[PDB]
Amino acid sequence: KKLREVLHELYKHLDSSAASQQEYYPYVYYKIDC
């Protein structure tokens, strides 16, 4: 969760305009699991 906040900060300046967030993050990501 601390990474969620920190990476939100580190990737919001990439967009710096339009993108509530929900699933349309300012970064690219997919989850791999068990």
Binding site: A18, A19, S20, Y24
Partner: peptide, 23 residues
Amino acid sequence: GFVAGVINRERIPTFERMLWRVC
């Protein structure tokens, strides 16, 4: 050719953002 869809200031700042984000 731009085609104009009209909405009555229902949620332009939100669903217009959503249109930008999905299309």
